[PDB]
Amino acid sequence: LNIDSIIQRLLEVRGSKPGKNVQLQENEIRGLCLKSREIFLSQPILLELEAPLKICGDIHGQYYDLLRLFEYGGFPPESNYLFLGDYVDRGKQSLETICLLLAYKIKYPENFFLLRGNHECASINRIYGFYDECKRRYNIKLWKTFTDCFNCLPIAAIVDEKIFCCHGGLSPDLQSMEQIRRIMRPTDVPDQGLLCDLLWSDPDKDVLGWGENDRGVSFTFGAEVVAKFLHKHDLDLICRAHQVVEDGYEFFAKRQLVTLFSAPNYCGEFDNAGAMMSVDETLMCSFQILKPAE
Amino acid sequence: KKVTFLEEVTEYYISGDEDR
Ligand SMILES: [Mn+2]
Ligand SMILES: [Mn+2]
């Protein structure tokens, strides 16, 4: 890979009439997938990260919003980043989005981190747009290459032994962090079980304990579940994504859990802000929110 | 170390994000 050339081309569309594509060659994109897979597999499936860093939720192919996030947060490696999954689907430029993220992972592997979301799954992104985008601009074989890459993404992260991060939420199957560590990669996301729950579950204020999730996949969990999880694992905060929230961030269970969502005006249907959470060296958390405007 | 939260949120407005 010539990673510098790739990043330069991805970044040079800044300020262009939004919607403008970057057409990397097929072999460069394949290259990003192959090299990032190597990096993902060589690093832990449960990341151990140190603050300061910036944490973002769902991007969903909103490439020009991703560029704005970097403009406000600082371009790598000026700031460290942890993304919480859902890079593709339901947006207009998933290819550019995932290519820039993989490129940054390759260039700054210890300053830049990506977790797996429920859309980083062939069965989901075949339907919700990514497959169609790949087919239109390249071919099926490239989409399949992406799936092999996604199957190797890490699943969760712990920041300074105090903040537990994952895309979806908790699992009633989860008793020790070691269970996450013993998940072998590459793997698909199962229709049920621990890995499914980590990518699909949701907090719910009206559930006591665990409940069946209205989505029809995985579970909901209540505030006392969060409290017991934190107490058991000596943690202060759960940081997750996976739900559109009006201000881009939303607290649950007296600030013991936070939901982050980083795609403003998602699907052009919600009028939600996108948020980015900064965690300083002392673990003070602050929020920057991108509010959509006419 | 202990997680704490800054009360002050920084807000930005992104023109063009309605009706992309
Ligand atoms: Mn999502
Ligand atoms: Mn999701």
Residue numbers in the entry:
A (entry chain J): 7 to 300
B (entry chain K): 639 to 658
What does the original paper state about this entry?
Reversible phosphorylation of the alpha subunit of translation initiation factor 2 (eIF2a) is pivotal to control of global rates of protein synthesis and to modulating mRNA-specific translation in eukaryotes. In animal cells, eIF2a phosphorylation is reversed by cellular phosphatase complexes consisting of a protein phosphatase 1 catalytic subunit (PP1) and a substrate-specific regulatory subunit. An RVxF motif, common to many PP1 binding proteins, is present in the conserved functional core of the PPP1R15 family members and their viral counterparts, and plays an important role in assembly of the active holophosphatase complex. Our studies reveal the essential role of a third cellular factor, G-actin, in endowing the complex with substrate specificity and provide the first glimpse at the structure of a ternary holophosphatase complex possessing such substrate specificity.
Stable ternary complexes were formed by incubating G-actin (purified from rabbit muscle) with bacterially-expressed [GST-PPP1R15 and PP1G] binary complexes immobilized on a glutathione sepharose resin. Crystals of ternary complexes containing either PPP1R15A or PPP1R15B were obtained, but only the PPP1R15B-containing crystals diffracted X-rays and that to a resolution of only 7.9 Å. PP1 and actin assemble to form an elongated flat object. The C-terminal structured portion of PPP1R15B faces lobe IV of actin, suggesting that the portion of the regulatory subunit C-terminal of W662 that is unstructured in the binary complex is poised to interact with actin and bridge the gap between actin and PP1. Whilst the resolution of the ternary complex is insufficient to trace the regulatory subunit's trajectory beyond that defined by the higher resolution binary complexes (i.e., C-terminal to W662), the most significant feature in the averaged difference density map is observed in the cleft between domains I and III in actin's barbed end; suggesting that PPP1R15B extends to engage this site and providing a plausible explanation for the inhibitory effect of cytochalasin D on eIF2aP dephosphorylation by the ternary complex. The C terminal-most residues of the PPP1R15 functional core (F696-Q700 in human PPP1R15B and W609-R613 in mouse PPP1R15A) are good candidates for mediating this interaction. This portion of PPP1R15 proteins can be modeled to form an amphipathic helix, which is found in other G-actin barbed end-binding proteins, exemplified by the drosophila Ciboulot helix. And deletion of this portion abrogates actin-mediated acceleration of eIF2aP dephosphorylation in vitro. In the ternary complex of PPP1R15-PP1-actin, the active site (of the catalytic subunit) is positioned at the bottom of a shallow platform constituted by actin and PP1. The N-terminal lobe, containing the phosphorylated residue of eIF2a, can be computationally docked into this composite surface, bringing phospho-S51 in contact with the catalytic site.
